[PDB]
Design an enzyme around this catalytic site. Sequence first.
Site, PDB file in Angstrom:
ATOM      1  N   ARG A  77      27.434  92.919  52.268  1.00  0.00           N
ATOM      2  CA  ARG A  77      28.161  92.188  51.241  1.00  0.00           C
ATOM      3  C   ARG A  77      28.055  90.680  51.402  1.00  0.00           C
ATOM      4  O   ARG A  77      28.247  89.953  50.421  1.00  0.00           O
ATOM      5  CB  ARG A  77      29.630  92.611  51.243  1.00  0.00           C
ATOM      6  CG  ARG A  77      29.889  93.852  50.419  1.00  0.00           C
ATOM      7  CD  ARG A  77      30.877  94.776  51.093  1.00  0.00           C
ATOM      8  NE  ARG A  77      30.988  96.046  50.389  1.00  0.00           N
ATOM      9  CZ  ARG A  77      31.654  97.099  50.841  1.00  0.00           C
ATOM     10  NH1 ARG A  77      32.279  97.073  52.005  1.00  0.00           N
ATOM     11  NH2 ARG A  77      31.690  98.207  50.106  1.00  0.00           N
ATOM     12  N   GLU A 133      33.667 102.758  55.964  1.00  0.00           N
ATOM     13  CA  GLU A 133      33.367 102.740  54.529  1.00  0.00           C
ATOM     14  C   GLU A 133      34.622 102.492  53.682  1.00  0.00           C
ATOM     15  O   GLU A 133      35.122 103.352  52.958  1.00  0.00           O
ATOM     16  CB  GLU A 133      32.594 104.002  54.119  1.00  0.00           C
ATOM     17  CG  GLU A 133      33.294 105.337  54.235  1.00  0.00           C
ATOM     18  CD  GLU A 133      32.384 106.482  53.861  1.00  0.00           C
ATOM     19  OE1 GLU A 133      31.208 106.217  53.536  1.00  0.00           O
ATOM     20  OE2 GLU A 133      32.833 107.643  53.908  1.00  0.00           O
ATOM     21  N   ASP A 134      35.117 101.258  53.823  1.00  0.00           N
ATOM     22  CA  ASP A 134      36.167 100.653  53.003  1.00  0.00           C
ATOM     23  C   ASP A 134      37.568 101.124  53.356  1.00  0.00           C
ATOM     24  O   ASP A 134      38.481 100.982  52.545  1.00  0.00           O
ATOM     25  CB  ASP A 134      35.926 100.874  51.505  1.00  0.00           C
ATOM     26  CG  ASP A 134      34.679 100.177  51.007  1.00  0.00           C
ATOM     27  OD1 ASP A 134      34.200  99.252  51.696  1.00  0.00           O
ATOM     28  OD2 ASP A 134      34.178 100.551  49.927  1.00  0.00           O
ATOM     29  N   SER A 135      37.773 101.687  54.537  1.00  0.00           N
ATOM     30  CA  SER A 135      39.107 101.987  55.029  1.00  0.00           C
ATOM     31  C   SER A 135      39.494 100.954  56.080  1.00  0.00           C
ATOM     32  O   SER A 135      38.637 100.314  56.691  1.00  0.00           O
ATOM     33  CB  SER A 135      39.168 103.405  55.606  1.00  0.00           C
ATOM     34  OG  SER A 135      40.333 103.594  56.384  1.00  0.00           O
ATOM     35  N   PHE A 141      36.390 105.320  49.975  1.00  0.00           N
ATOM     36  CA  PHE A 141      37.783 105.054  50.315  1.00  0.00           C
ATOM     37  C   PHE A 141      38.218 103.690  49.791  1.00  0.00           C
ATOM     38  O   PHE A 141      38.850 102.897  50.486  1.00  0.00           O
ATOM     39  CB  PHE A 141      38.000 105.176  51.819  1.00  0.00           C
ATOM     40  CG  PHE A 141      37.496 106.469  52.384  1.00  0.00           C
ATOM     41  CD1 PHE A 141      38.032 107.675  51.968  1.00  0.00           C
ATOM     42  CD2 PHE A 141      36.468 106.484  53.306  1.00  0.00           C
ATOM     43  CE1 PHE A 141      37.562 108.868  52.471  1.00  0.00           C
ATOM     44  CE2 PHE A 141      35.996 107.674  53.813  1.00  0.00           C
ATOM     45  CZ  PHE A 141      36.544 108.867  53.396  1.00  0.00           C
TER      46      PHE A 141
END
Lengths: 86, 196, 98, 43, 77, 95, 98, 465, 383, 58, 49
Positions: free
Chosen positions: B34, C96-98, H46
């Site tokens: 990102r 993964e985004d936690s 998530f």
Amino acid sequence: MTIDKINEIFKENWKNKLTKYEIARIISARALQLSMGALPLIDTSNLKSDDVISIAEEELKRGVLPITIRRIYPNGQVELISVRKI
Amino acid sequence: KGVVGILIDQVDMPYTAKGIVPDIILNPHALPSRMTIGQIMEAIGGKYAALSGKPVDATPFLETPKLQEMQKEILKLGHLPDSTEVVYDGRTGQKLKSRILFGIVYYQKLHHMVADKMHARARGPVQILTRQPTEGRAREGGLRFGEMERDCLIGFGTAMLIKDRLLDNSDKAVVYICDQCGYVGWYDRSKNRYVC
Amino acid sequence: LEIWPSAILGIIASIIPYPEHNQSPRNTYQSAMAKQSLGLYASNYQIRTDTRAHLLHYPQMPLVQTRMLGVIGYNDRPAGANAILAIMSYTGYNMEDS
Amino acid sequence: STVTISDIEMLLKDTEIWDKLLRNELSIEEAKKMFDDVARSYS
Amino acid sequence: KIDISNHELVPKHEILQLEEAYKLVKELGIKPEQLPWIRASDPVAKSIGAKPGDIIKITRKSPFTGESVTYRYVITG
Amino acid sequence: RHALATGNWVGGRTGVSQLLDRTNWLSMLSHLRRVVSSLAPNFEARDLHGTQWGRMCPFETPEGPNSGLVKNLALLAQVSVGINESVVERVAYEL
Amino acid sequence: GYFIVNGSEKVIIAQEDLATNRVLVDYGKSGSNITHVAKVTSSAAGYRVQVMIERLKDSTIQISFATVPGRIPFAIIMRALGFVTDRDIVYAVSLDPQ
Amino acid sequence: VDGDVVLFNRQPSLHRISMMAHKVRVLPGRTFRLNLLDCPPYNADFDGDEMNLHVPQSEEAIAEARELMLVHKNIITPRYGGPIIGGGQDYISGAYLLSVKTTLLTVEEVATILGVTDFVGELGEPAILAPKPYYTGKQVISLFLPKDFNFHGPANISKGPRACKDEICPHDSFIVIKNGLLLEGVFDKKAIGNQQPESMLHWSIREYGTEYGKWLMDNVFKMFIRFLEMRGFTMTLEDITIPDEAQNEITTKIKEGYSQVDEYIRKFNEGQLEPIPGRTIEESLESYILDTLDKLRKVAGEIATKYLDPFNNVYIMAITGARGSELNITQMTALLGQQSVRGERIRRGYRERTLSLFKYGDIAPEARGFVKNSFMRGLSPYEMFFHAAGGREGLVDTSQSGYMQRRLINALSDLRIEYDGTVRSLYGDIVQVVYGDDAVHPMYSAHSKSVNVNRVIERVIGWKR
Amino acid sequence: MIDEKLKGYIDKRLNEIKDKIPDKLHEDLRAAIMDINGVELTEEDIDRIIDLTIREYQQSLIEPGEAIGVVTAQSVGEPGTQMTLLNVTLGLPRLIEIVDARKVPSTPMMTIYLTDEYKTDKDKALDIARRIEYTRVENVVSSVSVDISNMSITLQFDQEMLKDKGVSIEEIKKIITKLKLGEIRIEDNDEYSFTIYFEKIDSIMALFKMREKILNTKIKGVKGIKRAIVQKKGDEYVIITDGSNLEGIMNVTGVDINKIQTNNIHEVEEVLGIEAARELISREIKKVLEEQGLDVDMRHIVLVSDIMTRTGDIRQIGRHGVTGEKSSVLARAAFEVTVKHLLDAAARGEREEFKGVIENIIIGQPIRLGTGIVELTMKPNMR
Amino acid sequence: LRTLAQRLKGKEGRFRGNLSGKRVDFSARTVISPDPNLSIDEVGIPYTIARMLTVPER
Amino acid sequence: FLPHLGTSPEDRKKKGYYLASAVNKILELYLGRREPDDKDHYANKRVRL
Ligand SMILES: [Mg+2]
Ligand SMILES: [Zn+2]
Ligand SMILES: [Zn+2]
């Protein structure tokens, strides 16, 4: 080579083998009729789980089920497969 | 952005040689693809601001102080300039073989909270017309089993599962049909007879 | 001559610290997420009658500031808090985004 | 008759010949002769 | 007009003898019109002189078995 | 009152008036400076035109169908109020 | 900067659109009888009307506005406005001979 | 209760493994908990995603769901012969860090690593006995491989100069397994990653069963996470900072590229520029400029990679295949390069100039959207404007796909495989005389192959080859 | 190095399994075993290799009762949502074009191979491309002058374009003379110019109409061919075309008619037949999926191609094709949410028989796929 | 008005709204979160949902 | 016709001159002295408040 060699290989392979759909159907039918009051054909005294589906699975693994699969071929020929001790 | 995956007590958190414990742990894998360098820069600037008590301005193109001065001042105040710490495992007490980056970052709580997003239905009211389960979390509810889920079930080859999902648990009913005309009759319930 | 080179941004892009070090889509997503955060929305919130409302109990003002934060009055009506952050892999619950 | 009607009638005749042959009411040679007759008469 | 049976997209077509076609339809358990159809006016059907009621044996190239055999039933049109 | 309370305006416009967003301070401040293009179409209408420098923010746009068509004012930009054309016409002719 | 209507706070959102009383020219669609197009959206006190000007493969200019179904030639619509001679129309269009 | 069978679904349901059968486990919380290896089949994340649950009510439905829809029976996807369930981000880097040949472990560390698994038994002797007793990461990994498994193949990290294409490699780039003993190579995306056909994990699942794959994913993949916890894995700001000599070299290269662009512009102005066929002049000049700037970005990225540490955590995450690429490293450390809109430089703006900061008719690289800074060093105001303009069209990024899938489903829903081996419709029409050409299911294929004969040879005589 | 004794053992042991696997697999196994070098090979190794190959082939067979149509549809349509983009059509729009059976593609294209004597010469390939490309008058004219004073149109020709197209002014004059214009008069104004004087016309509207009638006149080329490109692949020169005309190109001299390619499936069906059409359909679908990096097994594509060519003609999968030929009223009324199908069935007195899967699900009865193909029998007495 | 033929067509009509698809009983929806301690065959369920949905056992 | 220029019969010469100027602009576009107008240029956009 009746029609093709691949078809003969196919039918020879599935001659003495159960497909997953047949296993699923047998297990579901056995569990349904075992929950309705039937007597188990195995000991069922030292099994890990005492639900009907587990007992049906164990009854299928060790051939004690007097069930017969009827395979109808598209030309009308009939094949019978027995799961009772094969 | 992210969602909370677990909450860990202070005893189980990894601690620095000063005893400081993180409030939030961020995965290093979220950064490289990102390419948000401003977050690491903000962590370093926040640690500097907390250590020194001096204002930190991060206005674009006009940032004061610069990063190098911030790191030198961090070193002079008793911490490593690269903003890393020596860390021990709280569960076992053993020192980690690497140094971990600690910082101070501003976080925000969004109004998307799981306390307002979960709904389940076992049984309840049905429509007056279709006699099928209702709709919405305000009512008792009911999830739609659409055509794509039906296609998945057909692809798996489960006839009785299809029946259980689409007939038994939605609108199962019994009707009486005349064998001569095929029209729907009824049971009289008083004279004990079938009427077509 | 330009008066202020940072005046090419709006009021929400003016709260980002070091925005020129980030990739632009992340700066765009920030602006959407900054309108959904909970804090103090009014000083007289207790005598108003809003259909839906939130209140953060302990709001903090950012330690890393921008020049526009004090102009717009965000330091008096903040919507967040400063957290001690670690960047590490721990227990696998932050993947993964936690 | 018309080309479409001739096609339909020849399709029907082929169907009847195949049905009769498959029921063992005809031999292979008779079926061959009838197929040839229909094909030549509807060419 | 032009010979197209030698094109690289065209598989081999063969008219099937009546005894072989009869055996095929008996061992498949079908009627002849339950096979995929080929028109009598098809460019390759005319090249071999195929009439309606025949069965064409087609050999195509395959990346799994090398050669694959298929059957088509000649219809009118 | 109906025009202000429903948002349906005169001339076919819809959504002109909306309920002020009071989730936080920034929500209200951004809602008070929002500009919506009447197109909300062409991929060229969603581009960042070089003429937008100093007038609209290049980052505050929604994601998806409305991307590039809903904008927000830059810090120092204003909107013109306008004057009578006759004064300027007289000045130009006298010039 | 908002209104209180029936107890609710209402904001008027700014609407961005094209300038009304100006001429904008463009090319015509490819493979069509029209080669060049010009459009005007004249706005009155209470209503707006669009005026379209086309050039065809015939090198002729045709005028077309709202309350007339067809296309009127440029010189015909110019004569109805008080331009009687051809010289008046020609010198009203341009001074360049080309 | 624990062990009940339910249906777990995420929308949109594009294939049949969008809904699979799961076994219930009741836990504190108000959320649906899901294993990280189960995300690729659901395309789940998530970020705030939601999923649906269904409880079958009859005995027959539950039996069918348990027999046909269970998760581990559907590791290999039917679209192609490959595993759709496998390792992710921390799994790959943890496997690389554990399996590298420099990792040495003590008895206590080995017991800590193996405590998260089901392993109980003898560890054997340590790989190193003197001067101190040390275990190896490869030795610990070997405890979970079958004692007749053989595999030879390259690793993902073998993209660069460390590739040797043979068993003699000093970089751990070639994987050697003999009789279930990991003797060489590392574990990365090409050995355990998901959606990698003909990998070591794929061969293990194919030749030992999906139950073995379930056992392996539940035991060895936890060791990777535990070893990352012990080792420590972070990302600092010195991993993307280059020295001053690298910046000087990049500056000289940028000057050379600008000189080349200026020479092109001068040749265009003097009428000595040849066009490319099918394009006008002033359209060929743009192509030449774009080519020169692309080559400049590539060279600068090469320099920045050369003067950076090849063992920092960003490089590890990139080469192993966990996250990131080389373009990301180049943009974060060397320069962003040329920004483009629909394949062209940034041009829309004022008359003969994009912004008012530039001269009339200026077509120099900086005037049309070339960024010569990196994210580490920061962007200029107009560079930030150009970067925001270049990425605008990604923000816009389904009805056609849904309509096509619906049409296909309604066209094909009635086809069945018969006991004959024939594909027929439920109305009796014959579609294929034999399914495919060899009657082989793509789900059971060796990545579209019925049999891989080289794999069979490796299975039989791989321990001595 | 395998000695003759072990080679004979291999050949003997390989001849008793010829009926147990496909011929291609047997050939591949034989070719692979003969390439084993650097390892001392044993008879037991050969036995294990052959047994494992046979067992591995047997374990991969499809199972009867599988709902293969739904699986194929999901395997083809699922990657269609993952597609993220002469400028030929590609991706999902191209796939929709293929499966909707469009008569003419949006961007037609041909690949033309040449005979051996034209194969390796650039000049001959350029000549063929020159004489097959469709050229109008306006493609060689640099400026057009319309004169009002004497009703004359003057044409100026670009020398470079006139040479490139291989066109001469004399044949242009001959072509213009054959036109319907009427009584005209051509006079040379230069070596690359002439004027048409129109000794008859009266107004300016007709003068302009004559001008665009003249500028659109065809000079040469095969109809439909908009642009031709000569490409060097290996040592061979190939012609790439922006349009499509199979019949016209097949008559051109020097064209290899057994290797000509097209992306127009309806022309290929009309000219070459239906089996060529379905082979082309499979190739097109495979190429479209593969150029985007999406991995789909070829068996699904082959099944789709077979389903779209079953009736001897190319049919779309949608309303006017495979789906509309289904023999169920309720399935058609559910796919096409319209009610006109039910009205037609009532008017014609149709009968619906519940043979498919969708109608049985609609009314609520078990389907005949998967576990519905199995039928069971039991002996209760055996306890 | 909505008439006989309007109750049958559309995505909310009889066919696609009640015959091809329908709302069902014994179903739940919730946000998802990771759990590396589960098997690949398992799913984590809240206590509230476990006590509301039921399985009928003979 | 052009209500922004007036709605009286006395305001017809103004409309004629305006139409003449528009025709001049389209003719200038025809002869290659102009380019099509940019609709995304903010000189052509107005904001209603
Ligand atoms: Mg998500
Ligand atoms: Zn009756
Ligand atoms: Zn190496």
